[PDB]
Amino acid sequence: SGFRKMAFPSGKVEGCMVQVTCGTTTLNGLWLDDVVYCPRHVICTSEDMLNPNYEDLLIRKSNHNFLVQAGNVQLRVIGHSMQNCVLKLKVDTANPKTPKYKFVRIQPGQTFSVLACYNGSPSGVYQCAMRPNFTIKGSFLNGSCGSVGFNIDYDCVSFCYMHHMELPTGVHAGTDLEGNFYGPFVDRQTATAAGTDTTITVNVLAWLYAAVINGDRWFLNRFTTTLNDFNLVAMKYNYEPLTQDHVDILGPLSAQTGIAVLDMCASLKELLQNGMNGRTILGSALLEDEFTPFDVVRQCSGVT
Amino acid sequence: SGFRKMAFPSGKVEGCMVQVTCGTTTLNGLWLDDVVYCPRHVICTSEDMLNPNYEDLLIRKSNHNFLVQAGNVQLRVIGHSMQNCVLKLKVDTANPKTPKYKFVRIQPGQTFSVLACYNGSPSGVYQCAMRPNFTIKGSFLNGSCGSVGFNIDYDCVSFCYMHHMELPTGVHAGTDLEGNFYGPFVDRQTATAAGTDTTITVNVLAWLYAAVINGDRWFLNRFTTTLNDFNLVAMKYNYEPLTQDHVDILGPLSAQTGIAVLDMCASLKELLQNGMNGRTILGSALLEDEFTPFDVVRQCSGVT
């Protein structure tokens, strides 16, 4: 028993993190096969980050202006292309610790582990959710850029995120591994604010099921509700509307625990209307929305 | 900026996790050099566990009754000793991915990352604090035993925990890597209860400093207090008494932020007496005590 915000093992990813340096600016890169991927703002100086012209900046760069380094060993760059907001540096050595991988684009509400690095070296690993407003709330500082987010299905590493910037609200923005940003953000320092951050709801439900599986039942009630009467309430508290697809997704957990999804929705309705009244759920005093149904089922049934 | 409960990279440890099977019972083991360490209750059946005599149980066991396996590859056991609550199985192959390591015994309030495994295979990694009452609150299920807790100092892996059991209160107990339990617990299924757990006050303070460093100041006040007047209040809310040694430890964070420890103590006093009144701190609605001062300084200054 017990339930914790657990992240995927980071070993396979550690083997791929290298350091990329262009002039003065240094950041992390991902080394898969004989290709190194990294945030393109590597080529910027601090001076022109206000609104850099990356096409013009790249024209004046050559292979040798990029210093890629796998720990102690130097990597020779033998080609470089800009793909959206990422650089693809071809190196002359294939990473032999390159795992089976895929590049994926996740949806808001889905989760992944981030391996935060500095100078191509691991710092630590934590779990994130891609927020409805297409930001994430992690821990990054300078040098963090090029740190990747990912999931693991047995042998295969699904890379879904590469870190690029932090918004003035204290939240973070990045791209997929094809260099396409999540949300309306761009790799330049303008006053781009984030949109309203809403609560994922289905995830809160999954987490309430996790709570039941691990011995918390105080929040359960004899009440039930309709999707419509639930959603009328949920919207008031800045929650994503719950759809029939969401209900379908919550099926396995509902069946496992023998608590109907609409009964659990009723409990969440009571929780939102009246608060927790001093009590806690799995050691939290507010409703957690960064656990997917698959996350809960994974942890609770000990998947490797 | 931003502050998450980050967990150390698990790669070096992953390389050491093997599967150990004795008869029907299977659990995880740690393979360092040519030695495999694992919880001794591996030799028990289901019945045995009520109150096993391990000396008597070990009489009928031989090298060949232990099936050690590093993923797909089989390990030949060529010797086995019982050292406290752990078995030391000597195998005929030295783990070539054996990192620089130490075995350490942690103190209550100190933290470490746990790599939860099943059938010698990684599941995930999360951070823990050794509680004042010598338990931890993690995620373990059957087959998790032999999962290890650890810290990393550059090249060196400091193994400090190996998982053994879950108490009826839903909390977890284990040993160090010499097989000596943390707290008064034993590897048998009797009603041996844990002591009342208190809150690690110094850690809560460190975490409030983390909050300040990452842009939360709403909880700061024009009040200050004495250690004595603080502790009178802290005792009421089941908090560890704060000592001058604790104050000394909080020096660097106090100096960095320019907020006296006793001013921060006053803020914690207000927080405890009046609650957070709808606001949050680093995305939590109750006071976190599983971050050490060293944890905060590490994360905030991007140590690898």
Residue numbers in the entry:
A (entry chain B), B (entry chain A): 1 to 304
Paper text:
The SARS-CoV-2 main protease (Mpro) is the drug target of Pfizer’s oral drug nirmatrelvir. The emergence of SARS-CoV-2 variants with mutations in Mpro raised the alarm of potential drug resistance.
Q192 locates at the S4 pocket and forms a hydrophobic interaction with the trifluoromethyl substitution from nirmatrelvir. Q192T (9.2-fold lower kcat/Km), Q192S (8.9-fold), Q192L(4.3-fold), Q192A (6.2-fold), Q192I (5.6-fold), Q192P (7.6-fold), Q192H (8.2-fold), Q192V (9.0-fold), Q192W (8.0-fold), Q192C (7.0-fold), and Q192F (3.5-fold) had comparable enzymatic activity as the WT, and all showed resistance against nirmatrelvir (>22.2-fold increase in Ki). Cross-resistance was also observed with PF-00835231 (>25.5-fold) and GC-376 (>7.7-fold). Interestingly, in the GC-376 complex structure of S144L as well as Q192T, the thioacetal hydroxide is placed outside the oxyanion hole and hydrogen bonds with H41, unlike most previously determined structures. This suggests that the interactions between the oxyanion hole and the inhibitor thioacetal hydroxide, as well as, by extension, the substrate transition state, are likely weakened in the S144L and Q192T mutants, resulting in an alternate conformation in the inhibitor crystal structure. In addition to these effects on the reaction center, the M165Y and Q192T mutations also directly impacted ligand interactions in the S4 site. The Q192T mutation increased the plasticity of the surrounding residues, allowing them to better accommodate the terminal benzene ring of GC-376, which assumed a different conformation compared with the other mutants. For example, to avoid the drug resistance caused by the Q192 mutant, which is located at the S4 binding pocket, one can design inhibitors that do not bind to the S4 pocket.
